[PDB]
Each structure stands twice: as C-alpha cells, then as structure tokens.
Fold this sequence. Notes:
Chains A, B: K(+) 4 binds at residues 97, 200. Chains A, B: Residues 200-205 are annotated as: Selectivity filter 2. Chains A, B: K(+) 1 binds at residues 97-98, 200-201. Chains A, B: Belongs to the two pore domain potassium channel (TC 1.A.1.8) family. 2 copies of one chain form a homodimer. By secondary structure, the first copy, chain A, is mainly alpha-helical. Chain A folds into 2 domains: 1-70, no CATH class; 71-256, Helix Hairpins. Chain A has 7 helices and no strands. Chain A is globular, with a radius of gyration of 23 Å. Chain A starts with a helix and ends with a helix. At the A-B interface, helix 1, helix 2, helix 3, helix 4 and helix 6 of A face helix 1, helix 2, helix 3, helix 4 and helix 6 of B. One linoleic acid sits between chains A (88-89, 92-93, 95-96, 125, 128, 209, 221, 224-225, 228-229, 232) and B (11, 14-15).
Amino acid sequence: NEDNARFLLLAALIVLYLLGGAAVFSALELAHERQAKQRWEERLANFSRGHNLSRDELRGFLRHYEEATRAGIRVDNVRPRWDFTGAFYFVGTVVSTIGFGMTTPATVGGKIFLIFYGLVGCSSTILFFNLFLERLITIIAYIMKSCHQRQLWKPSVYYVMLILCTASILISCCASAMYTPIEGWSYFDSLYFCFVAFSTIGFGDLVSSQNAHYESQGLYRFANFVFILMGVCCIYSLFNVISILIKQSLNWILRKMD
Amino acid sequence: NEDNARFLLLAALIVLYLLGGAAVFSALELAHERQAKQRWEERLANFSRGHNLSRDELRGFLRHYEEATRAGIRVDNVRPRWDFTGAFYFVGTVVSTIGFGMTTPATVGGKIFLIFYGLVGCSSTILFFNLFLERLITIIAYIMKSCHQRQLWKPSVYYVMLILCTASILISCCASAMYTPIEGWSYFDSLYFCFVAFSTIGFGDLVSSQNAHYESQGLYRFANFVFILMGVCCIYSLFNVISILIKQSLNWILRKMD
Ligand SMILES: CCCCC/C=C\C/C=C\CCCCCCCC(=O)O
Ligand SMILES: CCCCC/C=C\C/C=C\CCCCCCCC(=O)O
Ligand SMILES: [K+]
Ligand SMILES: [K+]
C-alpha cells in the first residue's frame, strides 16, 4: 500500500540524512575538539607544575566542581536556580520541551513530579501550537482575501511557508538585537541561540537571562519570555509547513517511481 | 468566535499551569540547591586553605575547566565527541530535537550548517512521527477489527491513549533494565532519563552511551538507538492523543460556559 511505501521511503531518507550529517559534522570540527583538549591538557599540566599539585588532588577537586556545577554553580555570577523566577524559567523550558538543562530537578520528589507535569504540560502546549497555527492560517487567509478585495479560498502552502520564513527571520533579528548588547554575545552567537531555542532543540550551551543582575530586570525577563514564545510558535509552524511540502515531495517521488 | 475563545482559554490555562508549576518546584528543591552550594563553598574553602591557593588562582583554573568541559572534557573517561559515532549521536539528538547538548558545534561553520541541517531534519522528522502515528492507528484499527471478528470503524481516542500508555511503560521499563546494569545508574534515574529523552525535553544531565568503553559496544549502541527511537515515537504519539483529549475538554468547558 502506498502509505507503507511512503513510510519506508521516508525512514530510508532520514537514515541517509543522519549518515550524511554525521559525515559532515565530524569533518567540520573534529580538529577543534582535539585542539581544545590539547590546550586543556597543557593548562592542567602548567597548573600541576606551578603549584606542586598532583593530578590526583586536582582530579578530586574537579570532581567536586562537576558536582557543584550540576547544582548550578558557575564562576560567573549566576542567578539562583530555584527561586520563583528560576523555577518559572525551568517550567517554561520543560513545557515548551526546549529543556536547556541549566536548571534540572535533583530531589526524587522533583524527578517524580516532572514526569507528570511535563506529561500534561507538553500535550497542552502541542495543542496550543496547533491552535496557534490554525489561527495564523485563518489570519493569512483573511488578509489575502482583503487584498483580493483591495485589488478591486485558503492560502497555498508555499506562500504560507514564505510568510513564516519572513516572520522567523524578523523575530530572530529583533531578538538578536536585544541579546547582543545585554548578554555580551556576538551577534552570530545570538542568532544561533535564537534558532536553537526556537526550534526547541535547546542544547543549553548558551542560555539568555542568567546573570545575577541586569538593568530593568523585569522588562528584560518579560521581553525574553515574549520573544521565546513568538519564536517557538513561528518556527514550529515552519516545521509543520515544511513537513507538508516534504510529504507532497514523497508522493511525487512514489508517483514517478510507478 | 468559538475558536478564539478556545485559544484564549487555553493560553490562560497554560499560564496558570506555569505559575503553579513554578510555585511547586521552588518548594520541592530550593533547599537542596542551597545545601549543595553551601557544601561547595566549604569544599572550595578547604582546598584553598589546604594547598595555600588563593581564590583568584582557583577561579582562573575553574574558568579554564569551564572552557574545557564545553569542549567535552570530563573527569570520567568520556568518548570523543566528533568521531563519526559521536557525530552520529549528535545529529540523532538534533534531528529528534532531543538536544542533550553534551556535544555541541563550536566552529562558525558548524553553527551555520546546524541552522540548515536542523531546519530540514526536524521538519522531516515531524513528518516521520505523523506517518508513524497514522500507521499505528491503522494497525490498532485492524487488530480491533480482527478481535471483533474473533468474537464471532477506527478506535476511540481513549483506548488509543490507554494502548500508548502501556507501550510507553513497557519500553521505558525495558530501557531502564538495560541502562541500569550497563551505565551504573539507579533504576529510578534511568526511568527519569527515559522520560526526559522520549519526551524530547532532553536536559542532558544524564546521557546514555558515553563512557569510553563498554562490553559489546556495537550491540549496545544499536540497542540504544532502537530504544530511543521507539520511545520518542510512542511518547510523542501519547502527547498528540492527550492533546486531542484536552481539545475536547476545552470544547466541553466552553459549551458548559454557554
Ligand atoms: C500567553 C500564552 C503562554 C503560552 C506558554 C506556552 C509555552 C511556553 C513557551 C515558551 C516560554 C519558555 C521560555 C522562557 C520563559 C521565561 C523567561 C524568563 O523568565 O526569563
Ligand atoms: C529507521 C528510521 C530512523 C528514523 C530516525 C528519526 C529520528 C531520530 C530519533 C532518535 C535517534 C537519536 C537517539 C540517539 C541515536 C544514536 C545512539 C548511539 O549511537 O549511541
Ligand atoms: K529539547
Ligand atoms: K539540553
């Protein structure tokens, strides 16, 4: 049946996409990993020699620092993790499935409660993004009909994709223009953070709204909430729309394979 | 219009869900954060006093260790990040949007390439999970019809939810029974990892398949790939099904509000 042929074809194409990506990423920056690890080994050797410290004592101390960093210590001045604001940021990253993982539950009660809270929250949010998308399609259809009348049916998926690309770029550039002066990131690092957050990938190498102090903290936190919400809804809509164009491309490939 | 009333009602309910979660999590484990941070300050003081080291030199050394850990050093013996196997794990976490973030791109070329690779990969995968769900619904309908004939229409959403709960528990218990002896995690930590991976939240506090060596590495990596794939597809299906039951509950609340 054609639905099974589509499913197996898509699985094969995704597996080839993973093998191709793995072949590319290991070529771009395996050299950088090995340089940074060599430079670390040189720094650790210099520290060992300079202070008459054995690698045993240093490995013990660094094991304690690995424990402390999971509790949320940093050498930079970082906001408390489980004040009400930090917990609100945490639940925001759970419920959107971004999961930066700078804050993570540590008690068994927290671990248990997460499994139910994330279970209902993530379902409620995937509902929210589907209602958002249906509203956005309705708004675009209304505007396009008003333009058709102003020149005196629903929009096609390609023009919706071109609209959502424009929205995603405009939000991402505004967010980058906010994070660049406030967080001190480079502009390109802030664009990369914007994509990593809005796609809900969320590695957590960069996280906004973390220093112990900012000018106008409340306004900055509110703007960060608004920008992350708008970005996630726009890029998740873009993912759905591209997924529909992929499905149509698979149906075309299977038709041409007839 | 009823669609706007549903959208605004769901936004209000989600905002109250975030405020309630933030109020709960900050109560469960703010005491643990402050204990672990005090114990760290005590360890750092003991190390400073014991080796005649100033907090300036130690802060410098720890800043270098924060740089080295982002390049993927650990005190434990950890697998190279950007060999072909590590890059395949990375792209697996990008394309599923899990994003554990133990491996992250560091060159500008890697950061650029991620924005296009994740853009097409995540759309292709959200397509894959929607084809998976349509196939699973078709299989459940066929089996239920065969049972109706064996007792000699599509299934209702509630029984699909009860099936997907059972599948998610059975996969999660099998995965936990694999990770517990091999990774040395506690059983409950491995269940929590299973949920955090399968929901695609992916904090990255726990990550499987990371030590420099295992018995039967190839079989273990293959089993880890299979279990994470099956888990993500089952729990993402469960999220969709619960989101439909939420939508029906909102429609009921709006009807009763008439
Ligand atoms: C009004 C509708 C709300 C819908 C919410 C749904 C999903 C949540 C999505 C994104 C929010 C999480 C990002 C961080 C927010 C807190 C930022 C801060 O405090 O610094
Ligand atoms: C056959 C169909 C494949 C579909 C793939 C789609 C999405 C990918 C989802 C999950 C895989 C990522 C988890 C880690 C895999 C590598 C594990 C390892 O190497 O240790
Ligand atoms: K994620
Ligand atoms: K993460």
